[PDB]
Amino acid sequence: SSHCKAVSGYSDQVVHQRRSATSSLRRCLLTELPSFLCVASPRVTAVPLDSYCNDRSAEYERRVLKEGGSLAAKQCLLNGAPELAADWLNRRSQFFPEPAGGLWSIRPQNGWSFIRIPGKESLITDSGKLYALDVLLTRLKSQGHR
Amino acid sequence: WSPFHISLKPYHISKFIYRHGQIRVFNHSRDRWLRVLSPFAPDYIQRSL
Amino acid sequence: PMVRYCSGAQGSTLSFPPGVPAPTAVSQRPSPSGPPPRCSVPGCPHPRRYACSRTGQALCSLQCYRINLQMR
Amino acid sequence: DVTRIERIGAHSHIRGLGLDDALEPRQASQGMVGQLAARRAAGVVLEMIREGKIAGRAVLIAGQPGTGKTAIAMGMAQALGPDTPFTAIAGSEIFSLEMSKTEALTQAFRRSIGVRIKEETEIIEGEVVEIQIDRPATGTGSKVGKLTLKTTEMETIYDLGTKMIESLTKDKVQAGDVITIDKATGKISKLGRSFTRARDYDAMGSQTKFVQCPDGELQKRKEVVHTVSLHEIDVINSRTQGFLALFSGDTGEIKSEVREQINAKVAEWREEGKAEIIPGVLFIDEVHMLDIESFSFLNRALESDMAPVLIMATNRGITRIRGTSYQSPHGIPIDLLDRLLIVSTTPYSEKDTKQILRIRCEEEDVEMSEDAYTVLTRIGLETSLRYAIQLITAASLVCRKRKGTEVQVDDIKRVYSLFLDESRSTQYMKEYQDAFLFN
Amino acid sequence: DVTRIERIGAHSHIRGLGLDDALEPRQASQGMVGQLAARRAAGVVLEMIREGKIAGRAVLIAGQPGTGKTAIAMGMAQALGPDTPFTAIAGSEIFSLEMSKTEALTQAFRRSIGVRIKEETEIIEGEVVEIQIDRSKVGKLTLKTTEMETIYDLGTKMIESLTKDKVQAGDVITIDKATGKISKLGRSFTRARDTKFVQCPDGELQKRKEVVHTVSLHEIDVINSRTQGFLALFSGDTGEIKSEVREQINAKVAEWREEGKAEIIPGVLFIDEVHMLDIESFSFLNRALESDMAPVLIMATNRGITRIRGTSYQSPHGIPIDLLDRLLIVSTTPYSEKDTKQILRIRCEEEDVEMSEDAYTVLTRIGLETSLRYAIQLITAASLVCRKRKGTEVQVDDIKRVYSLFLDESRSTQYMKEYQDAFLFN
Amino acid sequence: GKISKLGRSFTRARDYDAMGSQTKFVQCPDGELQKRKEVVHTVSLHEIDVINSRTQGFLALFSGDT
Amino acid sequence: TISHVIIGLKTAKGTKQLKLDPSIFESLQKERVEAGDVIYIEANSGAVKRQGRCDTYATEFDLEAEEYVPLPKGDVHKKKEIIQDVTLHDLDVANARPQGGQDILSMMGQLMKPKKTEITDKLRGEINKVVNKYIDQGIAELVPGVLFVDEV
Amino acid sequence: TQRIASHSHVKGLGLDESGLAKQAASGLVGQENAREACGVIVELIKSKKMAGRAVLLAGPPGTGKTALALAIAQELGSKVPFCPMVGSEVYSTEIKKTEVLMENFRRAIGLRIKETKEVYEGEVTELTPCETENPMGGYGKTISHVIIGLKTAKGTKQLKLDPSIFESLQKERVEAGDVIYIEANSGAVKRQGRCDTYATEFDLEAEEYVPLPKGDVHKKKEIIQDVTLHDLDVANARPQGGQDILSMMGQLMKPKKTEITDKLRGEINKVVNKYIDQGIAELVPGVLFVDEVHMLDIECFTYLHRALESSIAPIVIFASNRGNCVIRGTEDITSPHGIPLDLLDRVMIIRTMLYTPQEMKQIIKIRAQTEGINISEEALNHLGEIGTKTTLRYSVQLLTPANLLAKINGKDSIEKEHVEEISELFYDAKSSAKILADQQDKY
Amino acid sequence: TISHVIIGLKTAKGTKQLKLDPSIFESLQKERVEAGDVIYIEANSGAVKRQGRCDTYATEFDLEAEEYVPLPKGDVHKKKEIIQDVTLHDLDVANARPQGGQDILSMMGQLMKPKKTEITDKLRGEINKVVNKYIDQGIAELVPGVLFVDEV
Numbered sequence A: 001s002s003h004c005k006a007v008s009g010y011s012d013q014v015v016h017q018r019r020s021a022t023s024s025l026r027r028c029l030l031t032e033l034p035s036f037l038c039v040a041s042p043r044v045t046a047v048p049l050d051s052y053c054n055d056r057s058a059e060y061e062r063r064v065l066k067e068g069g070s071l072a073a074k075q076c077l078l079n080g081a082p083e084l085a086a087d088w089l090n091r092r093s094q095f096f097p098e099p100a101g102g103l104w105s106i107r108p109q110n111g112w113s114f115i116r117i118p119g120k121e122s123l124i125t126d127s128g129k130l131y132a133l134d135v136l137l138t139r140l141k142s143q144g145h146r
Numbered sequence B: 001w002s003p004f005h006i007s008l009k010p011y012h013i014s015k016f017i018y019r020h021g022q023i024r025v026f027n028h029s030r031d032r033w034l035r036v037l038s039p040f041a042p043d044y045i046q047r048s049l
Numbered sequence C: 001p002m003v004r005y006c007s008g009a010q011g012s013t014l015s016f017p018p019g020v021p022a023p024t025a026v027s028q029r030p031s032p033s034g035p036p037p038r039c040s041v042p043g044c045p046h047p048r049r050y051a052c053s054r055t056g057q058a059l060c061s062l063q064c065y066r067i068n069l070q071m072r
Numbered sequence D: 001d002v003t004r005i006e007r008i009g010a011h012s013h014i015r016g017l018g019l020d021d022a023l024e025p026r027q028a029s030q031g032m033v034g035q036l037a038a039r040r041a042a043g044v045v046l047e048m049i050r051e052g053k054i055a056g057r058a059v060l061i062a063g064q065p066g067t068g069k070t071a072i073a074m075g076m077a078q079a080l081g082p083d084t085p086f087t088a089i090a091g092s093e094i095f096s097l098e099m100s101k102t103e104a105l106t107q108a109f110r111r112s113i114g115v116r117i118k119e120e121t122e123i124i125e126g127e128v129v130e131i132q133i134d135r136p137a138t139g140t141g142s143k144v145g146k147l148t149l150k151t152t153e154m155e156t157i158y159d160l161g162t163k164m165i166e167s168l169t170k171d172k173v174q175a176g177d178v179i180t181i182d183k184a185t186g187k188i189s190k191l192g193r194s195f196t197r198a199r200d201y202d203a204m205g206s207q208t209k210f211v212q213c214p215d216g217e218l219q220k221r222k223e224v225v226h227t228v229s230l231h232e233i234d235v236i237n238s239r240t241q242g243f244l245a246l247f248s249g250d251t252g253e254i255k256s257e258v259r260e261q262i263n264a265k266v267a268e269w270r271e272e273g274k275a276e277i278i279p280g281v282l283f284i285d286e287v288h289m290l291d292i293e294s295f296s297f298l299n300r301a302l303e304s305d306m307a308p309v310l311i312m313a314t315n316r317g318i319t320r321i322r323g324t325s326y327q328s329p330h331g332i333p334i335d336l337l338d339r340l341l342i343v344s345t346t347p348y349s350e351k352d353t354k355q356i357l358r359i360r361c362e363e364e365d366v367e368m369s370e371d372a373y374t375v376l377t378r379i380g381l382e383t384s385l386r387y388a389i390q391l392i393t394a395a396s397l398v399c400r401k402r403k404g405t406e407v408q409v410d411d412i413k414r415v416y417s418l419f420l421d422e423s424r425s426t427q428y429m430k431e432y433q434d435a436f437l438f439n
Numbered sequence E: 001d002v003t004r005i006e007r008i009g010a011h012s013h014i015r016g017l018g019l020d021d022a023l024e025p026r027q028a029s030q031g032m033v034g035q036l037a038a039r040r041a042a043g044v045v046l047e048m049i050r051e052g053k054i055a056g057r058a059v060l061i062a063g064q065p066g067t068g069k070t071a072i073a074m075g076m077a078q079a080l081g082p083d084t085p086f087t088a089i090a091g092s093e094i095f096s097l098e099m100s101k102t103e104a105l106t107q108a109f110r111r112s113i114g115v116r117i118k119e120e121t122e123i124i125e126g127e128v129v130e131i132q133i134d135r136s137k138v139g140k141l142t143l144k145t146t147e148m149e150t151i152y153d154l155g156t157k158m159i160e161s162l163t164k165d166k167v168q169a170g171d172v173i174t175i176d177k178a179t180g181k182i183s184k185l186g187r188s189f190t191r192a193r194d195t196k197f198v199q200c201p202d203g204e205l206q207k208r209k210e211v212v213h214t215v216s217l218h219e220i221d222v223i224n225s226r227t228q229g230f231l232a233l234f235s236g237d238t239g240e241i242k243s244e245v246r247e248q249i250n251a252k253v254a255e256w257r258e259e260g261k262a263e264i265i266p267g268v269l270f271i272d273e274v275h276m277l278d279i280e281s282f283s284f285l286n287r288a289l290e291s292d293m294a295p296v297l298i299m300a301t302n303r304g305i306t307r308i309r310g311t312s313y314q315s316p317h318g319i320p321i322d323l324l325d326r327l328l329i330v331s332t333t334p335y336s337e338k339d340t341k342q343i344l345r346i347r348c349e350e351e352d353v354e355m356s357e358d359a360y361t362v363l364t365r366i367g368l369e370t371s372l373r374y375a376i377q378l379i380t381a382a383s384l385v386c387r388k389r390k391g392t393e394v395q396v397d398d399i400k401r402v403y404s405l406f407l408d409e410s411r412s413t414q415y416m417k418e419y420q421d422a423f424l425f426n
Numbered sequence F: 001g002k003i004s005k006l007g008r009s010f011t012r013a014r015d016y017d018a019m020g021s022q023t024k025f026v027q028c029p030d031g032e033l034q035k036r037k038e039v040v041h042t043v044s045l046h047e048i049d050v051i052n053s054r055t056q057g058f059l060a061l062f063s064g065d066t
Numbered sequence G, I: 001t002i003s004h005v006i007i008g009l010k011t012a013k014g015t016k017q018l019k020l021d022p023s024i025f026e027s028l029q030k031e032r033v034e035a036g037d038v039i040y041i042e043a044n045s046g047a048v049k050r051q052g053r054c055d056t057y058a059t060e061f062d063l064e065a066e067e068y069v070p071l072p073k074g075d076v077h078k079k080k081e082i083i084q085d086v087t088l089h090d091l092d093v094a095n096a097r098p099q100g101g102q103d104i105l106s107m108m109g110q111l112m113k114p115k116k117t118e119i120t121d122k123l124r125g126e127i128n129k130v131v132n133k134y135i136d137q138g139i140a141e142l143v144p145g146v147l148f149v150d151e152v
Numbered sequence H: 001t002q003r004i005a006s007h008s009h010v011k012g013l014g015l016d017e018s019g020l021a022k023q024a025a026s027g028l029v030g031q032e033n034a035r036e037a038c039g040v041i042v043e044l045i046k047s048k049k050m051a052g053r054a055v056l057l058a059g060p061p062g063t064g065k066t067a068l069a070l071a072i073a074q075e076l077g078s079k080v081p082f083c084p085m086v087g088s089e090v091y092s093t094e095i096k097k098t099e100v101l102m103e104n105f106r107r108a109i110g111l112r113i114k115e116t117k118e119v120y121e122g123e124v125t126e127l128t129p130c131e132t133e134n135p136m137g138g139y140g141k142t143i144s145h146v147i148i149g150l151k152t153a154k155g156t157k158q159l160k161l162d163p164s165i166f167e168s169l170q171k172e173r174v175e176a177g178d179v180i181y182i183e184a185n186s187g188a189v190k191r192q193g194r195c196d197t198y199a200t201e202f203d204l205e206a207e208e209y210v211p212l213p214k215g216d217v218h219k220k221k222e223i224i225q226d227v228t229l230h231d232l233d234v235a236n237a238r239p240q241g242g243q244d245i246l247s248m249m250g251q252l253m254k255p256k257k258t259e260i261t262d263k264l265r266g267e268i269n270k271v272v273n274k275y276i277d278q279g280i281a282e283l284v285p286g287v288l289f290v291d292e293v294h295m296l297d298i299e300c301f302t303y304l305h306r307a308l309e310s311s312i313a314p315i316v317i318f319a320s321n322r323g324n325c326v327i328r329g330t331e332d333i334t335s336p337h338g339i340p341l342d343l344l345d346r347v348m349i350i351r352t353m354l355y356t357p358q359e360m361k362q363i364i365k366i367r368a369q370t371e372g373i374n375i376s377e378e379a380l381n382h383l384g385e386i387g388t389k390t391t392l393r394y395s396v397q398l399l400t401p402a403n404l405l406a407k408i409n410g411k412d413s414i415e416k417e418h419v420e421e422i423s424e425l426f427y428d429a430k431s432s433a434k435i436l437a438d439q440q441d442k443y
C-alpha cells in the first residue's frame, strides 16, 4: 500500500499474443486503479479569505503571507526539506537523482485545476453513426480490406 | 466547464485594533518572563541533569 | 558536451568528453601517527585532553595544569 | 500438510444451494440437506438477483436458532459466484465512533453495487541488453537515450524521451533484466534477471530470484478486469490523491453532492458502454440489533434506484425494538416489516440431523460407527445440533489419542462426560448459589 | 420582476414597533397591532437598550401560543435599527458538538456588545489622465477632478502598485495613501469613445476622511486566538477560547473606556424558546448577568408549569426560581375579533391580494376557532385557487374549498381517532 | 559534539545597552573543565512507553497528548 | 525574485506573446510545462491545465508515454460565457474551507480530510449580500425550491 | 532476580501419555477433568485444522480458571501466538468495539518467514576509478568500474563496483577514514561516520566516532522473522515513508487508530496465500484468551456471533465467574454467566469445581516453596485451616507478611505465633463485611 | 563580519546613540526599517515597532506608499518602574505544548488549530521547582489568591 499510487489490490492478468493467438494467464499481481475514475469536481471555488489594514507594516506582513512567511518554510512545504530543494535544484547533472519529497512529487491525474476539457473520444459516444463506423472500421482493418 | 469562481471583499481590521489589540503585542514583556521561567531553558536542563 | 553511460552486455561504461570537468577523482590514505600525544608532565601518562593557553603545553586535568603553572 | 489461511469453519462444507435446473431443491446435494421450502425461496431470490432488473428488494429469513438461516445465506453467497459482489455485515458493524449510523448504512449500501471495467493496454515484455543515457553537461536539463530489447526470436532498438528516462533511473534498471513496459501509462514492472547475462558481473549490487526470457513477439496486449464498488469510487473522488482511505477507512461522512455526481457519472458510463454496472447482495445478520433510526433510514434508502437486494436475518420473537419501548414481531417496526418478503425455517428432525452429522464428518475427515452415529443423533436431538457438531472433533482427537482409527461409543460418552452442555451446566450451576457472583 | 433573497416571510409585514413619543401605543401603526399592555412595556426596554447606561438586564415574554410574543421581539429589532448589535438565536442552537454548552453562551454574549472607534485616513480619489513610467524607475501621472488637476511623481513602491493593477487613461481611481491600494471605480464618459460608467469625482483630490468602525468583543477575542484568527470567525473553527485571554481583553477595553480612546456600544441578545435549556445553562446565566459588560437579553417562553430539562423538577415557565428573580416578565393576551380581522387585513395587504368584504367575517371566524394562524396561511392558498379560477377577487366559495383541502390539527386529530388501527404506536 | 549555549557571563552584561529577544546572564562555570564521571538515571517505565509511542513522543510527556 | 513571465502561445490563427503575473509562472513550473506542450490558462482564478505535447512532435520518439493533443483552433486569447446552476450552500461551503487559488495554503487544504464545520451567521449574511448584489446586476436569477423531509 | 508474580508456579497441566491428569504435577493439583479437557483443547489447537471454536471455563471465583489458561499457554510453547484480553479492552474512545475485537482476533494469527541478508561493510581506504585505456569516439576516456578497498578487524579486500555508485558516493560525504556499508540486494551506499582510530587527531570534532567493525568484510546470514497478521494491517494502513507531505504530516500529527476496512484484509489474505503456496512463509494459528467476558456488551456478543463461524478466526478461550446475571447493554435480560444463550450454544463449557482442604494445603505448600519460604507443619496446617475457613486467596496472601515478621524476629521460618499475629493484623472480606453491617450507621 | 550595530535616535528634545547586538539588528531588518524612520524600542523585551517615516522626508516623492508621522515631542530615554503579575496556570499553559514561535510571517501556524489539553503532573512539579528556585533567588515573590465558585 504505497502512499503515492492507487492500488486496488490483486487481480489475474491475461496477456494476449499477436502470433498464433496464444493467451498467457498470470497470477495475483498488484493492480493500479484506472485513472478515469476521478471525475468529480466542486461546484464552486473561492479564493482564501485575506484581511486588510491601513498601514505599511500590516501591508508588508500580508504581502509576506501572500508568498509564504519565510523562504525556509516555503521550500520545506514545497520540496520536503531545504536540502531536498537544493538536491532537486542540482539533480540536473545526476544520472540517478534521489526521489523528490515535496508537493512536486505528488502528481494527481487531473492536476490541481478543476477545469475539464471535453475529451475527443466523446465523438464516438455521442453519435451512434460514428459508433457503428468505428466498429466497422476496426473490423475491416483486422480483415485487411481497403 | 469550470467551477464558478467567487471572491469576497477582504476583511477589514482598523489601525487602532492592529496597534493595540494583539495580546501577543501588548504582552511581549509578560511572555518574556514566561520564557525566562520556563523549565526548558538549557541552564535549568543542565543543572537538573 | 554529452556524458554517456552505457550498461552494456560485457559490462558498464561511463565516458567523458574532451575538456569535461571530469568530476570523477581519486582518494588515498593520509599517513597516520604511531604514538598518540601524551600529557606534557612526564609523570602523568594520560593522553592529551587539551593544550594550555598561558604557556602552551599538552595537559590532562586540574592537577597537571597546576603542576605546569607552578613549574613555569 | 500445508495449512492455508482458510481453515475448516462452521459453514465450510456448504458449496451452494443444491438445486436442479427446474429450481426444485434436492434432499441432499452440495452440502445442504432438508429445509425444502426455505431452499426453494432462496433459489427464487437467487435467480431474481441474477436477473438483476428491479432494485430495493428486501427478504427476511426467520426461524429457530440453529436451523440454517446463516447456512442458507452462505449457500446462496457461494452459489452467486466470486465475480458478483456480496457483502456480509453483522448487526453491530454500523455503530461506529467515526461516522453516523445513516452514513454507515449508506456506505454499506454503496459497497454492494459493483462496476466491472475491462482494461486492455499495449505492453512490451522483453529482456534488456543495454541502456544508453547521454546526460547533458549544462544546457537546460534535456536528456536523450536509446534502449535495446531482445527476445529469443526478434530484437529492436527504441528511442527514449524525457519522461521514461526518469522512471528507468528511479527503478534502477540495468543490463540482464527482463522488463514489461506499459505503453499507455509508462510504468516499468520488474520481472527478474536473466541467466546468460549474469556471467559478467561486478560485486553484488542486486541479489534476488531468477527468471527466463519472454518468447515470441516483443509487443503484446494485456487485459485486466477491475471490479470497483461505488463506495470506493466515492472515497476516491471525495479528496485529491486520497487512496489509503480505501484501506485505512479514515473518510467520514462524505458529502452527498459527491454521491449524486458519482451516480450521474456512473449512469453516463453505463450508457456509453465502457463499463458495466452489476448490482450485488447485502447480508445483514442478527439485524434485530439495529436501532429504530437505522430501520427508518432503511425505509427510505430502499426506495432508491441504486439500492442493493439486502437480506435480513432474525431469530427473536415478540421483543421490544432497540432504542424504544414498543413491542413488535422480530423486533422490527411494521413500517420496514411491511416492505419485504418473510421466509421461515422449520426445526430439524432425526433423519436429516443424521445426514448433517454425516456430511460434517465427511468434511472433517472423521469416521464413526453406526452406533456412534445413533448416539450422536440422540445427543443432537436432546441437545442442540451445534453441540453434536462440536463433539465430532473432540471425539476424533480422543480416538487418535489412544492410537485408534474408528470413533466408538465409548469415546463419545467420554467426551460428553468431559465437556458440558448449557442445560447440564445450568443444572450443576444451581447447587453453587452462594458460590457464584450476583445471583 | 426580480426576486430578492428576502421574501414575504411570517414576520416580514412588521416594520418597527409602533409607539408615540409618550410611549403609548396606537391601535394600528407600522404593520403590527394589538397588545396594548405589551407594546408600552416593550418601549421602556427599547429605551433602556438605546441608552446603554445600565448593564445586564433580562426580560421574558410569556403568553399563549400565537399571541405575538415573537412578533413584538421581531419589531423591536427593526425599531432599534442597525449600528447597534442585535444577535437572535434559538434556545436549541447552543448545544454544539465541537464547543461546550457553557462556552456557547459566553460566545453569544460577546457578539452583542461592541467597541466603536474613529480614525482619520488620507484618500486620493480622481480621474487619471496620463501615466508615464520610464526604464529604480521614474513615474509621473496627472490626476484630474472636475475642479482641479495635479501632476504627481511616483516612488518605486507606487510604480509596482500601479503596474500590478493596470491603470489606463480615463479611469476613476481611489488610493489609500498610508497603504498603497489601488481601487478603481470605473471609467469616465469622456474617454468612453473608442465596465461600470462613473462620472468624474468632485472636490479636492486629497481628502482627510474621518472613518468610524465598530468591532464585536467576541470578534476581538477571536482575532487573538490563532495566527490568523479572523479566518475561524467565518468557518466557526474556533473552539473553547481560553478564559485568561478574555480577562486580559476585558481589562484592555476597560482602560480604553477610562482613557476615552474608544467607546462601548451595548447590544441586544434575543434567545428564542428558552423553555428547553439545561439547568446548567440557567445556573451559568445566573452568574453571567452580573458582569459589567453584560448586554440586555430578551427571552420568550410559551410554556406553563412544566418539568425543567435536565432534572425532574417543576417550576413556572419551565425555568427555576433563581433565574426568574433576575428577569422581568411581560405577559401577552389572546387576540379578539377586531384585532384578528385587522391582522388579516394587514397580511392581505402584505401579500397584495384583493379579496371580498364578505370573506373577512368567515376568515375571522375560522381564525378564532383555529388559533388564528391557520387563517393566516389560508389566504395564500385562497389567492392561488382564485388565480387558477381566472378570477380577480377572492370570494367566500373559494375559501371554503381551501378549507376542505388543507386541514388543521383539531380536524386531523378528530379524523385520527377513527383510523386507530392503521396508525402506529398509540 | 553538540553545543548547548547557556547564556552570557555576568561580567559581559554591559557592552550592550539594548538586549536581544532572549538572553540570560549566568555565572561563569567553576572547577575542572572537562569532567568525566558516572551518573545514575531513574526513569519510569511510562516514559519509555511514551517515547516509543510515536516518532517524537517526548513532547507528550509534558503535553499529556498521549 | 520574479516579477514577470513571458509566454508565447501559438494557435492555428497565429502566435502571440503575453506578460503574466509570477503566480502564473509558479503554476506553470508546478505542472511541468515546457515548450511545445498545449496549455489552457484561465485568468479569473489563475488555474493552469496541461493536456500534453502537440501532435506535431509525434514521430520524435519511438517509445513515449505522454499523450498528444492537436493544435487548438481559434484565437490565443478568448472570452466565453458559461451558464451555471448553483445553490447557496455551495457558495457557503466553498467560502467556509476555501480550495481555489494557486497558493500553498489552499493546495494543501485540498489534501486534508474533508471534515464538516459549523458555519456562523456572518458568512451567511455576507453571502446573502453578495448574491443580492449579483441579482441587482441582472445576471443572478433566483429559483427557490423544495426541501422534502421524510419520516419527520 | 525476576520478581515473583501471582501465577509463577504454573508450568503445565501435568498429563500422562494417555492424557490422564496426575494428582499433582507441574504446579497444578486437582481439577483432573478440567486438566484433561484442557489437554484435549491443546491437541485441538496443535491440530491446525479447526477455526473459531470456543471454550468457556465456568466456575466460582478463585478456582483456577485463569491459571488453566496460562497452563495451556505454557504447554503450547512460544512459537504460537497467545493473546490475552479482558472484557474492558473493547470500550475505547478512539475506535468502535467490533474493531477492537477484530484487531485482537487478527492478532492471534502469526506468520513466520525466512530470508537472507547480504552486505559489504567496513572501513574505506581508497577509491580508484579504474579506467579502460582507449576512450571511445568523441570522448576523452571510458571509466570501466570503481575499485573500493574495505578493511575490517579481520582483513582488507578490494571490490569492483559499478561506476554509477560513484554518483551516490558524492551524494553523501564519502572520504577516506569513514566506515560504509552497501546492501547486496539493494545496492545503495550509506555512511556511518569516521572510525575511532582517528578519534584523537583533534580535540573537538562535531562528529561522533564509531568503532571499527569486527568480522569479515562481506557478511551473509539467514534470518527468520515472525509477524502477526495484525501487524500487516497496521503497516499497510499507515505507510511509513518520508518523501511525502502526507506521510510526514500524519507522522507529525497525533497517531489514532483507524477502523480498518475489510477490503484491505481481502488483499493481505490473497498475498499471504500466494506466498504460502510458493513455500516461503509458514502460517501458525494461535489462541486468544478473553478473561472476565461478562464485561462485554450485547453488541460485542452479537458481533462475536458472526465472528466465530469464520474460516480464519483463531481458537478463543473465554473465562467468566458470574452467576445468573443481567447482560450488559440490556435492561433485565438475565442469563447464566451474564452471557446470552444464543452465543452460549456455540461454546464448549468446562466446569471448574471448588478445592478440598488437602488440595488447598498442597497449593499453599507449592506457593511457599516456589516463593522461597520455609514453613513449619504446625503453622502450615493452621494456615490451611484459616484458608478453608475463608478462602484460598486469603491463605496464600499471608505467606509473605508472616515471613517478614519472622525475619524481623530473626527466625528463619514461620511458626504459629507469626501466622496468628498476621491474621490478627489483616482482615478478610467476610469479617470486613460483618463490621460494615454492624457499623452501617456511621458510614 | 558583524559584532554590533550603532544606531542614532533623535527627537525634538535631544539625540542619543545606542549599541545593538545582532539579534536586535535582525529584528530591525525584519521590520524593513531604513535610515529616517520613527522607531520604538523596548530594551527589556527587545520589541521593535516601526511607526512610519518622519514627516521631514514627506516631500521626497509626490506619491509614496509609505505613511509619514511628525517627529516625536518627547524624551528619547524613558525610565519607569513596572510591576508584573502572572499566575501559575499561565506558566503551565505556556510550557505544556510547543510555543508557536510564530508572530506573523509564517504559514505553519495555519496548520494545527490550538486545543486545550490535559496538563501532566511532571510539568506541574517542574514548574513548582523552578518557581521555588526563582523566589529563593529573590527575583519574584508569590501571592496565594482566592478561588470562588458559584452553583457548586
Ligand SMILES: Nc1ncnc2c1ncn2[C@@H]1O[C@H](COP(=O)(O)OP(=O)(O)O)[C@@H](O)[C@H]1O
Pocket: D010, D011, D031, D032, D033, D034, D035, D064, D065, D066, D067, D068, D069, D070, D071, D356, D385, D386
Ligand atoms: N440445511 C442444512 N444443511 C447443511 N448444514 C446445516 C443445515 N442447517 C444447519 N446446518 C448446520 O448447522 C450449523 C448451525 O447453523 P446456524 O448457521 O447457526 O443456524 P442459524 O444461523 O439459523 O442459527 C451450521 O454450521 C450448519 O453447517
Ligand SMILES: Nc1ncnc2c1ncn2[C@@H]1O[C@H](COP(=O)(O)OP(=O)(O)O)[C@@H](O)[C@H]1O
Pocket: E010, E011, E031, E032, E033, E034, E035, E064, E065, E066, E067, E068, E069, E070, E071, E072, E302, E343, E376
Ligand atoms: N400583534 C401582531 N401584529 C401582527 N401580526 C401578528 C401579531 N401577533 C402575531 N402576529 C402573527 O403571528 C405570526 C407568528 O406568531 P408568533 O408571534 O410567532 O406567535 P408567538 O407569539 O406565540 O410566538 C406572524 O406571522 C404574525 O403575522
Ligand SMILES: Nc1ncnc2c1ncn2[C@@H]1O[C@H](COP(=O)(O)OP(=O)(O)O)[C@@H](O)[C@H]1O
Pocket: H006, H007, H027, H028, H029, H030, H031, H059, H060, H061, H062, H063, H064, H065, H066, H067, H068, H321, H363, H392, H393
Ligand atoms: N490447580 C491449581 N494448582 C495450583 N494453584 C492453583 C490451582 N488453581 C488455582 N490455584 C491458585 O489460586 C490462585 C487464584 O486462582 P485464579 O486462577 O485467580 O482463580 P479464578 O480464575 O477463579 O479467579 C492462583 O494464585 C493460583 O496459584
Ligand SMILES: [Zn+2]
Pocket: C039, C040, C041, C044, C045, C046, C059, C060, C061, C064
Ligand atoms: Zn597529566
